[PDB]
């Protein structure tokens, strides 16, 4: 008496919308490098050289 | 929110040797948003009778609507909303990605001397420095101490020579910020007495230190809106107004920069 | 898409929707998992829309220590309760969430711990109806409605009726184990065919006046 | 008496105030003194707000000669009553009127001959509730309510109760002498301690659904 | 238990506890360091503020420097207050002078 | 909203920096015979001792 | 608010070029295309026979 729908009843709005993505990205940090603060840095030779005397 | 996680290793150089490569791998996390509501209604004769005693009825009710919504938002910031039932909201004291509570070396700040109290803060900073391998220097990092309103007055414990706890904190950690909150007093109800909490965390990490595209933001409060007027309905002898707000709780993005103590 | 038949008219409405404008009353609530009930549930089912729900308790404490903050006034509900709380409706409020298999799949139930709106008064509300006598039945304009509880005995539940389905009945032929909703009328005409266990005809959605 | 303790949140509301907006019905009326009741009143009390009232008569004649002037429609009520005429509310409408010992004192009482507003239908109404049988009682969401008549027998009134106090009770059990307000629900759960004659606990404020 | 037969640290703890209660009774709405608190104390016990450490730090110096806005008063009516089982009990009262309109909307 | 090439280039630079720091702290194949040595791995060093405490 | 058409062919692109690689004595070119098949949006207007 109430007629039959041609589509299955469902909630209209999918969850793929209604979502806010934060603009940033968090990056893994790992340990630190501190040899320069301990003993300094000095440029002596050049690339494609062999030895220092 | 997402993560980057790069990868790659190097080898020795050669003219005709193979070239190593790099890659990456990402992940994501989700939270939920909660909304609240509160309204008001005023009649014509009520305003006239209220003005006799020099009081504004409409303005008083409007102020309470804003205050009532702020209390709802503030409570969600500390404790999660329906976290037990299944809602993924969480809060400052309920985040799942946290280093979990610990017992401090000193059993309690009550009935504890100057040496006992000063030792607890030193251990917390040491764990923070151990957890992040020299990536942050507590001397000039702007670290924040949460503490509790029931224990904030114990920072004035003095030695017989006049040296107090606050004197040592200022000199050793000039950039430390100290706050307090009544919500951190009664936390877990251990046996029959409330247990005060202490949370130590970094406010922000420099981009050059990490390389993340966002800011440091170790802790973030996700608020969609604080006060929205839904509408006004005018009737013959009265009118009704509505207000609403939205929030999503608190999110911890860098669990390695947080140290927490359970008992005092 | 999916339309294989053409009919002469549109359906008047969908279950869980308001069909007429007038006096109405509604309250929010939070759904409790049916497994949380202590005396166990003899009748089970999903949190389908347009089904009756019952009061379960108060969840407004919002705290863990000795002092607690009563931030809001909230109510917690279960699929079937002796105390009537309302009928879930207004499907436009919620989100699809897809299904277990794949997203974008038609779903009509709410997950546990989610919010909802429940109706205590409505001039016109479209809900699905059921036959509780396993025989042909014609309702007509003026009737009464009832809903199944969880504590309904299996002896009184030979038909596999769901946890919170709505059942129509005549003035003096109410089933033995149901709970009547006071001042509720069908205010519409409908007919239902013969019924049997395991082959439960879902009935037809029909207008209904809650109060 | 000034604030001697600081709480985390404010109280939800006060008795006699509407707490939710929806369908509503109310009528004005005038108050009769209990002394004017012909068969005398066994139960007595003041004209306190948030208490039931009963119909007394019509006072719209306004004249004494052969041609009368009916210029208004008015009705008058009694505190106890047997013909229900709503519940007094909206304290912001009236004035203090003073007290016997001294003026400027807190009181919900109203003098005889004053005009009030009585609610027949209300979506949410905060009221002061009482308990019967002198035993601990838990109300929960969906119990019923009744009010004390004027002519309540002293045998059925062992606990000294006011003339028009509101009493909540479970569906199965009701006190012997009371008048039930039709289609009223507790809505808000509440717990009340044990009672004794002359030491009745005033109860706690509670939301109501009058109709 | 009593300022009598108590050392410098013991007396300091009592004053610290009283200040702590003010910050607890009000839910972290007033900070005692900037509130101009008044100490009532008792006549028979006001002289105990001169207790000194061997280094030379007194109770009064600790109060006068940590809380510059604190005011110390004495009164004879606070000596015998409740008249305990067989001895009078000296009272100590601590209260805030004024409350700002920003703290509460009064 | 992610640039793969920039991420890979930054990772390559970080890996090269890590290799340089590792060589700085520990020598490269000193046992084999290569003469590189490091801060904590120099063969002609006074060797570790034990503290009084 | 749609074109109807009952049937529709979903073609992302007909013909695109990827890149050109040049070597000492030759060069290579690459091309690609995309499609998603056919979609029947109104299945109430189709009559089909298997035999004949």
Author numbering:
A (entry chain B): 66 to 118
B (entry chain F): 119 to 382
C (entry chain g), D (entry chain h): 1 to 211
E (entry chain E): 225 to 330
F (entry chain B): 172 to 224
G (entry chain I): 331 to 382
What text comes from the article?
We reconstructed the E217 head using alocalized reconstruction with fivefold symmetry imposed (C5), which yielded 2.8 Å resolution at 0.143 cut-off Fourier Shell Correlation (FSC). The E217 head has a maximum diameter of 790 Å and is built by 535 copies of the major capsid protein gp25. We will refer to the reconstruction of the E217 virion at neutral pH with an extended tail that was determined at an FSC = 0.143 resolution of 2.8 Å, although no significant differences were observed in the E217 head because of alkalization. We found that E217 has a T = 9 icosahedral capsid decorated by gp24, a likely cementing protein stabilizing the E217 capsid. Each gp24 subunit consists of two anti-parallel β-sheets, arranged like the petals of a flower, to form a tulip-like structure. Each E217 gp24 trimer contacts three neighboring decorating proteins and six capsid protein subunits in three adjacent capsomers, burying a total surface area of ~8642 Å2. Gp24 trimers at neighboring threefold/quasi-threefold axes generate an inter-capsomer cage. The interconnected architecture of gp24 trimers is stabilized by extensive van der Waals contacts between N-terminal arms and omega loops.
Bacteriophage E217 infects Pseudomonas aeruginosa and is part of an experimental phage cocktail developed to eradicate P. aeruginosa infections in Galleria mellonella (wax moth) larvae and vertebrate models. E217 is a PB1-like Myoviridae of the Pbunavirus genus characterized by a ~66.2 kbp genome, significantly smaller than the classical enterobacteria phage T4 (~169 kbp). Here, we describe the structure of the whole E217 virion before and after DNA ejection at 3.1 Å and 4.5 Å resolution, respectively, determined using cryogenic electron microscopy (cryo-EM).
